[PDB]
Structure formats: C-alpha cells, structure tokens
Design a protein around this nucleic acid. Sequence first.
RNA 1: CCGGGCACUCUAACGGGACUGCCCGCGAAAGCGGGAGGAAGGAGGGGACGACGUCUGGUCAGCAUGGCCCUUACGGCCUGGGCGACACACGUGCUACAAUGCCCACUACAAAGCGAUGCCACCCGGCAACGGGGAGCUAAUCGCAAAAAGGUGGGCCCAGUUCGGAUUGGGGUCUGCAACCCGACCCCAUGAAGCCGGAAUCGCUAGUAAUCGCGGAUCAGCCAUGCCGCGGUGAAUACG
Lengths: 118, 127, 60, 98, 155, 206, 80, 24
Amino acid sequence: ARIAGVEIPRNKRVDVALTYIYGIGKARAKEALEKTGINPATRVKDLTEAEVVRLREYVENTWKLEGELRAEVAANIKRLMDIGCYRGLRHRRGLPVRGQRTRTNARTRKGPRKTVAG
Amino acid sequence: EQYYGTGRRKEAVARVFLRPGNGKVTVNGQDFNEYFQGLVRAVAALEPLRAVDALGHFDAYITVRGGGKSGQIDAIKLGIARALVQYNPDYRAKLKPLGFLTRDARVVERKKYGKHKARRAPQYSKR
Amino acid sequence: ARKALIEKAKRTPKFKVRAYTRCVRCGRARSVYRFFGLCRICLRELAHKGQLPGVRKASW
Amino acid sequence: KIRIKLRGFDHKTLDASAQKIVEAARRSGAQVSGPIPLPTRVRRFTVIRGPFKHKDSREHFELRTHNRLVDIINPNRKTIEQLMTLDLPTGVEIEIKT
Amino acid sequence: ARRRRAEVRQLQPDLVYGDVLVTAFINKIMRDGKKNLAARIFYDACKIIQEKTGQEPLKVFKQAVENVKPRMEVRSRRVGGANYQVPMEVSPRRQQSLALRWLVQAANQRPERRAAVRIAHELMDAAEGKGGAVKKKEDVERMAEANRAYAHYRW
Amino acid sequence: GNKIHPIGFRLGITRDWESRWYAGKKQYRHLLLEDQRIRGLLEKELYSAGLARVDIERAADNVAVTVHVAKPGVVIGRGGERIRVLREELAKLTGKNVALNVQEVQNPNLSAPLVAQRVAEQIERRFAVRRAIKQAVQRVMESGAKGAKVIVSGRIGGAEQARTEWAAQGRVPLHTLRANIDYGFALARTTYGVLGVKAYIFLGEV
Amino acid sequence: PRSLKKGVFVDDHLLEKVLELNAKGEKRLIKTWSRRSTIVPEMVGHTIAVYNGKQHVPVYITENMVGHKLGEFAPTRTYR
Amino acid sequence: GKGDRRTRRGKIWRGTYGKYRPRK
RNA sequence: CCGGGCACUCUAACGGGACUGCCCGCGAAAGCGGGAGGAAGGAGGGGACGACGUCUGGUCAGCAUGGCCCUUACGGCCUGGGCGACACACGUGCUACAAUGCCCACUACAAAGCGAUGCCACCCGGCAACGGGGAGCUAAUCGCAAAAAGGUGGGCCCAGUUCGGAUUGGGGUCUGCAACCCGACCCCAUGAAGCCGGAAUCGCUAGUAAUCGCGGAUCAGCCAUGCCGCGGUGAAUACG
Ligand SMILES: [Mg+2]
Ligand SMILES: [Mg+2]
Ligand SMILES: [Mg+2]
Ligand SMILES: [Mg+2]
Ligand SMILES: [Mg+2]
Ligand SMILES: [Mg+2]
Ligand SMILES: [Mg+2]
Ligand SMILES: [Mg+2]
Ligand SMILES: [Mg+2]
Ligand SMILES: [Mg+2]
Ligand SMILES: [Mg+2]
Ligand SMILES: [Mg+2]
Ligand SMILES: [Mg+2]
Ligand SMILES: [Mg+2]
Ligand SMILES: [Mg+2]
Ligand SMILES: [Mg+2]
Ligand SMILES: [Mg+2]
Ligand SMILES: [Mg+2]
Ligand SMILES: [Mg+2]
Ligand SMILES: [Mg+2]
Ligand SMILES: [Mg+2]
Ligand SMILES: [Mg+2]
Ligand SMILES: [Mg+2]
Ligand SMILES: [Mg+2]
Ligand SMILES: [Mg+2]
Ligand SMILES: [Mg+2]
Ligand SMILES: [Mg+2]
Ligand SMILES: [Mg+2]
Ligand SMILES: [Mg+2]
Ligand SMILES: [Mg+2]
Ligand SMILES: [Mg+2]
Ligand SMILES: [Mg+2]
Ligand SMILES: [Mg+2]
Ligand SMILES: [Mg+2]
Ligand SMILES: [Mg+2]
Ligand SMILES: [Mg+2]
Ligand SMILES: [Mg+2]
Ligand SMILES: [Zn+2]
C-alpha cells in the first residue's frame, strides 16, 4: 500500500502501519484516519483503492515528508552550523544540545565508550 | 428481627445487618456479586455462615467503607461473625475454633528514615 | 553568616525574585524553614530550649 | 448561632477553658450541644541532626493545633454575665463567629 | 535461625477447594503482590486443565506436585581443601517448597503465550510423569546416586 | 556523639515551655523574633542579677514577661528605680505596650542554669574546676535534690589539650523521662579558650 | 524549542544605543555586557563585542542570526 | 512506560496534562 | 438533600484491659512446653530514648570561640561569568528490555498532609501547556482531587513492535527584569541503546520484601528520578 514518497506498509492496522512513514507518528495517523473517513482497525490488505487514494491525497500534501523532511532537518543543522552559534558548536563536536551534563552519561550523542587510561 | 455485627480489617469498616430470608446480600446499593465482581476471595465474606448453615436460612444488608476491597471482604467476614454471635451465642462453639471472631491486627508498618520503604535499606557497593 | 549578606532584610532587591529566607538568628545561607523564619540548626536548638510553643518530640 | 472556635497548642488548656465556658453557660441556657472536638492540624518538621553532614541522622518534631467547638443555643444575658472576662488560661485562643 | 526454630507460617485455606497446597501454589505464582491476578491465573488454568483432559484438577494437581517432589539432593561441605557435593534426603516441607518452585519456574519457561495455559499444561505434564519440572527434579535426583561415593560425609 | 538535649526531651511531660501562646501562619515568625529579642535583652543586662527563667505569655496583645530571679532586689532596685528603665527600654523595642513581672526562686543552688552560671563564674576567674564541681554538687545535695551532676568541657585550667570533667553524685537518670530533671548550660570565655558548663539536677519523682 | 511568547525582550541598554547609532550611519565596535537581550532585525551590519565573563570578543552580525541571542557566538568555555 | 511522556502513565508520573491525558 | 436523631463509623480527651493471674506437665528457683478464656499474651506491633569511653572520627564553611595573617586591602557594592565544563572512571538512583504486558475508553475503593492573592470547584477559548471570567473556603463543611495498581469491555499478537523514549528538528505556553551560557512544561515529527545483564556484589524474617499511587518541607520558577511521611494489594523462606 503505497501512500507517500516511497512507503509500503502491509498486513497490520492502518493507523499503526502509517507510523512507518517518516513524518507520521500516532497523532498524524489518527488525524489521517479521522479526516479521511476510514476505519482505523482495518487491515492494510483490505484497503480500498479509493480509501488508499484518499489517504494518499491527504498525507501526500498536507505536511512535509520523508525526503523533504530529512533534507529540511539536515539543512537546519547546516543552517545553525554555518552561523557561529553555540548550538552549532555542540552539533559540531558531537555533544548534547538540550543542556544536559557531559561529565557522565553522554553516551547516546557521543557514541560508544572509548576508555583512556588514568 | 435483626442482628448487628461490625468487624474491622486493615482500615476497613463493614456494618453488617442480618435478618431471615433467602440469602440475598446487598452492599451500598449493589448486590454482593456486582460490587465485588470477579474477585476470587469474595466467597470468604460469606464463609462464616457455612458453620451455621445460613444462605437460605438468612439474609443480609451490609455497608462497607475504607481501605481496599480485600479489607472490605474480611471486615464483612468479621461483622457477619459478630452478628451471628449476637443472634445465637452458642454459635461461638463453632466460630472461634474456625477463627472467625479474631480481629486481624496486621497493619501496614510506618516508614522509617534512612530506609526506602520502612525496612528496605539503600544498597551499598564496595565496603 | 556574614552581616552584609543579610542585605535581604532591607529587601529592595531591585527585582522581586531575589528574596531568600535568611534564617533570622543564625543568618543561614542555605537551609531555612519559612514558617519559623529559622534554620534547621537554629530550629533544633530553639526547640530543645523550649521557646517554641507546641513543639514536641514526634514519635509514632 | 453563636460559634465559639477554640484553638491552641495545649490540649489540657483547651479542655480547661472550654469546660469552664460550658460550666458557666450551663447555669443559664439550654441543652447546649457542648464541647465537640475537631481534628488537629499537625505540622511536622524533619531536621538533619548534625550540621555538616551525617545525612541519615535527622530527627523530626511536630506541632499540633487543636480545635474545639461550643455552639451555645439560645443564650440571652446570664450566659454572658459569666463570659465577659473571667478565664485563667493564656495559651488558649478563642474566636466568636455568628 | 540462631535461637529459635523459626516456626512455619500456616497459610490460609483456599476458597475454592479448601486446601492449603492450592493457596501455597497461588502464592508461588503471585508476583509484585498480586494475589488476585495469580488466583485468576490458577483458576482459569484449572478450568482449562479440567476441560482439555476430563479429570478433576484436584487430583491432577496433587499427583503432579507429588511426582515433582524429589527424595535426595546435594549440599556442599568444606572438607580437606575445596568443598564436596554430599548427597542427603529432603525435608517434607522443603520437598513441598521445591516442588512448587520448580512447577512455577518450568511453567513460565514454556512456550505457551498465556500464563494460565502454561500453568495448565505444566501441571498436566507433571501429572503424567514428564515435563520440565520433573526433568529438573530427576536431575536433582541424578546428582544423588552419582556422587554417592561421599555417602560417609552426610553430616 | 549522643545524649540529645534533656529539656528538649522533657518539654512534653514534667517540663513546660519558656513561651506559651498561640499564633498562625502570618504571626508566628516575628512574634518568636520578639521573644528572642526579650530574652536577648534580659541576658545582656540581668546576667549578674541572678536570673534563671524567662516565661513569656500572650493572650491578645497582652504580654506577661515573667523573670525568675535568685535576687529580686537587683531586679526591683531601690525604690523600684530599676523596674522603670529596662521596663521602659523593654517597651522602647516592642510597641506592644508590655508590662514586666518578677518572681522569687528559692535555693539558687537548686536551679541548674544558676549552678551552671556559678561554676562558669568560678572557672572564668580560674579556680580548680573539680572543687567547684564537687562543691556545687554538694550545694545541690544539701537540700533535697535526690541527684546532681556537673560536666565541664575541654582546656581545663588552661591546659593545651582538651579534657572532660566529671563528679556527679546521687542518681541522675537522663535516659528515663519521669522525674523533673532540670538542666542548665553556661559558657566561660577565657584567655585560653571556651569552656562549656553543663549542670544537671534531679529532684522529685512524679 | 525556545520561547519568549510576547513582546520579545530586548534590554534598553543596547536598544536605545543602536536605534540612535543607526541614524548617523554604521558604527564600529560596540560595548556589550548584556547578553540577556534578544537580537532584532536592524542590528545587521554592525560589529558587536560581547563579554565571555573575561574577554571582549567581536561578532559580525548578519541577517541569518537575527532570531537568536547575543552570546551564541561568544563561547564561555575553552577546551582543546 | 512511565518515561513515555505522550502516554497516560507517563503523564500521571510527571503529573502533567495534555492531549493524551485530559483533565476531565 | 430536607425534618430530625446519636445508636452506629468517625473525630479527640480521659480511662478500662495482661499480670505467666487459671489448669496440665517439667523444675530446687526463676522460668519453659502445652491448653482454655480474651480484641490481644509470654517484649502484642512501631517508635522516641543510645552507657564509662573509643577512633587526635566531623564541621571554627551554621553558630559561638583561643591564638596567627588581611587592611584602598581577603573586607565592600554591582554587572557579566562560574559552581551545569569532558577523551574517561566509580557511587547512588530513575526508566526499561514486555503478553502476570502495553494502550484505549468506562468505573470503584485510601490515608496523611497543604492553601488569604493562596489553593482555585465551575463556564468559555485553545489539540494542549495555559489564558479570560468567576463561586466558595478564615477550611471534619471549600479546594488541591484524579488516587494508582484493581474491575468489566476493546484492540495489539511474540515483532527493536501499539515494547522502550534516548537523541534531534520545528512550533508554543509559564514563572520571572531577564531562560545563549543554563529552567520547567505542552504540541508535531524524529523513535537510539536495551530482547534480563561478566567476575563480583546489595536489601529484607510480617504486612515484611515486592509493587502501586498520594502528600509534604525548601521554592517566583524549577533541572525532585532526591529526601521526609501516607495508605492500596500482599509473599517466599529460616535444616542449621
Ligand atoms: Mg501505619
Ligand atoms: Mg507500602
Ligand atoms: Mg553511607
Ligand atoms: Mg564568624
Ligand atoms: Mg530564591
Ligand atoms: Mg532558598
Ligand atoms: Mg540526605
Ligand atoms: Mg545557664
Ligand atoms: Mg580544674
Ligand atoms: Mg525526668
Ligand atoms: Mg508507548
Ligand atoms: Mg439536620
Ligand atoms: Mg449516650
Ligand atoms: Mg502458654
Ligand atoms: Mg495456648
Ligand atoms: Mg491460645
Ligand atoms: Mg512490645
Ligand atoms: Mg516497645
Ligand atoms: Mg510495644
Ligand atoms: Mg529504655
Ligand atoms: Mg573530634
Ligand atoms: Mg579532616
Ligand atoms: Mg570571633
Ligand atoms: Mg554540583
Ligand atoms: Mg581532553
Ligand atoms: Mg469536584
Ligand atoms: Mg464543623
Ligand atoms: Mg460534611
Ligand atoms: Mg467547621
Ligand atoms: Mg484483554
Ligand atoms: Mg539491537
Ligand atoms: Mg516503536
Ligand atoms: Mg520479545
Ligand atoms: Mg530482624
Ligand atoms: Mg514545590
Ligand atoms: Mg536538565
Ligand atoms: Mg514526588
Ligand atoms: Zn540558623
């Protein structure tokens, strides 16, 4: 069931299977099922060509999505990076941005542990 | 006419009134099986009457309050016990050997400082 | 603590946020109970003396 | 409606003052509902024992404000003849709301 | 138990059967203090085990727990260097405890999705003389009869 | 590190507060501050007059400051003169229109804070502390007082190392709160250092 | 996720200074000890020296960096 | 579970309100 | 809800009640085993209480204090910054790795506390944080308030997922003079590691462990997952 820029969920509930699209979580899936007038509990296989085409109509152009969204986020990174912003420096050095402590437990942003001696 | 038993269990109070009848017991505007629906220990509430062969000889109305529903069930048990004793004192001969007239005094123990919940001590590592 | 560091008593802090408790007797810098206006050490000693009515030994 | 809100840090003081008031009002007035007790406001304060740690040594104290109610019914003069100012207790505190 | 004998707790009887071993097993199933959910597990398992095989769940439960109880085991004793595995018999109370623990642990190590289904099929297999709990029991007994060369270290 | 304050233990039973009144959320703070100011003033001036306890009571803007003295002649003064100055200076700090009250305490050696003050005085002029201790315990024991106890702090007699003094008599059971155990602390500030003086006195049973 | 939610706050200090500086043409280096204030559009083109807490570092203000604050370009920290 | 802030349990653990846990 | 009434649950002040007193046994005695009666027993359960002293234990950075150094200066005000830094290492925790589970509606049962511009029922606006309006409670009467696990109903179907919520992009509210350094919170989106943990090591013997929520102090706000209390359900085992 192709909906957005290449995206094919299958064999699951529709609202759940829409999370597999990039710019769609649970909220936007519920909104699509709401305004498109489609039963959320339906399986992917049982989707009508008209139901699929209406879901495509809505989801395709209401919000920016997979390729545009990835490029927009990455270009936002580049945007606040080329400026001399401190946030850009935190993105450069590969350190957390939201203002956490970096003495311990910066693992998610800094990668696997590289243990120097002491 | 009517006989009264109060009972108390783990911060619960279950006023129990016993009369003759068919065996229908109601609680706070609900039948005994609708308010305690799907609780496997609910049958213990009407257990004290199985040494006296009630439930067909008797009938009840109970008002319970406080704590959780398990304490409610056990307070109902104790209240039925005391109502049964005030009805017929000879029932004591079949009650205390079963143990239905004893107030269960097990209370939740207060929380102490230096602990997590009143006994659990925080874990140390490399003493 | 320090005398000048009880400058909160003349409050006029130039901004309403800069008001801190500053326990009256000991001039506590960090930990002050607002209800007594005292700090835990001053509260302990004063409750030991018996100058705070109603204060007993908690036990249960 | 004459509400007499009694409050204090001492329970025996509240009992003394309230019973004196009720004994004064019992020689003049009605079947007075009398000394009803109200729940007590409990303020607890936990304090670390020693300055400069030993964190896990703290002890706590508790203040308790006790409350009593009188509710005299149909008093006219002789009740307030023994009411104006006759009481000994100091730590007691009395309010009158109508 | 340095001073006293540590008197055994006397469990409450059961509301359905009136038997104490059922309450003990229901306690062994309970986790996080949920005796209601554990009782529902055990009794839906009772219905399933009484339907899938046309026998009474009472005697099947009893026969399974009886089949899982071992008669010998091993304890480590420090003698002349490193300790050795010394076999010995079992207390009836400890037999009960070990049987119920092996029952629950072999039931939850099963593939079945629902808990009650695991409990029911575990009880069935144990009542027939096979299954995982009886396998652990027979391994415990195989520890005996094997290091029996240390039968002079009984203590 | 043990032996919490005894009067803090005793506050509930067989002991009473130095201030007994009532307040609420909006009043307790500066009222307690006012009590502290009163006790501060009375410890500034009346130290050498032999004062033991200051009991302050409030009904409703009425203050009842009660000074227990071992020598009321210095508090009243000649012709009442001294009950004019510091009784007005008392009202020149608090605008509550407060009056002052005096009371007699018998046997200044029977009040523990007074005994503490006495031993601290004899320490400041550098007497052998143990003689003051045993003599104080005897002054206590020579008039009822089924128990008596005195503790002195370190740097005794000016010694470099700190020590701990002793010589109680009778029976002084600080552990059990039954029998009206009184306690007083004094501070001897001397050239070598500071000496704490703890006077425990045990009298009565119930 | 950054929010000021109404009347975006800019301190008077550099506000009046720069709105009077613009009237006479672009000025050279300015003095700034207030990094609490927000950047406004008309600041583009100047050269603003901000305080690290120790030093005075010049910053070239451009159109791209209008929505941010003065101090995003003055690093307090010094490492490696 | 409790750390998922856009679920109901994560809302009651933080004590907040929103779309996934309306007040009433 | 009303009339009305205190019997009841309750609130809070004084009492009664347990003493190995009764009986069998054993014993020289204390006492021990067992049994009845009793709400309860052999210290019924929990506190407050920590001996002569010890380690030259801890803080003059709370206070007070003995000596030695400071004086356009260590004192003193204010702005900014810092205590939040990171290639690492431990301690204490929080959340998890799921089906006895998650989420969604629906519904029931706590105790202890807090609140005069402070808590904020209720109506409106907004997906929401929150805003506007506004009632009441000097609070056993009002409000925080909904307890949560649980109950029935439903969907999920063993899968890095309707598990898990880290990280990051954007939008927005709020306290505050002011959120770059460096706040909480809401919304959209992104949906990382992790599928029960190596050697080793910790807590707990009865309502205890385990789990579930609630409140409080400090505080304009809050980095509280801490700390101090409260109750809901409720074990396993102790040969020695
Ligand atoms: Mg309790
Ligand atoms: Mg608990
Ligand atoms: Mg430690
Ligand atoms: Mg100083
Ligand atoms: Mg502040
Ligand atoms: Mg503060
Ligand atoms: Mg601590
Ligand atoms: Mg003294
Ligand atoms: Mg001497
Ligand atoms: Mg005493
Ligand atoms: Mg989730
Ligand atoms: Mg009425
Ligand atoms: Mg009566
Ligand atoms: Mg016996
Ligand atoms: Mg017996
Ligand atoms: Mg017995
Ligand atoms: Mg006891
Ligand atoms: Mg005891
Ligand atoms: Mg006891
Ligand atoms: Mg004792
Ligand atoms: Mg020392
Ligand atoms: Mg040191
Ligand atoms: Mg000094
Ligand atoms: Mg720090
Ligand atoms: Mg480096
Ligand atoms: Mg409501
Ligand atoms: Mg009332
Ligand atoms: Mg009411
Ligand atoms: Mg009232
Ligand atoms: Mg289901
Ligand atoms: Mg993986
Ligand atoms: Mg997922
Ligand atoms: Mg899995
Ligand atoms: Mg123990
Ligand atoms: Mg707060
Ligand atoms: Mg943070
Ligand atoms: Mg909390
Ligand atoms: Zn202080």
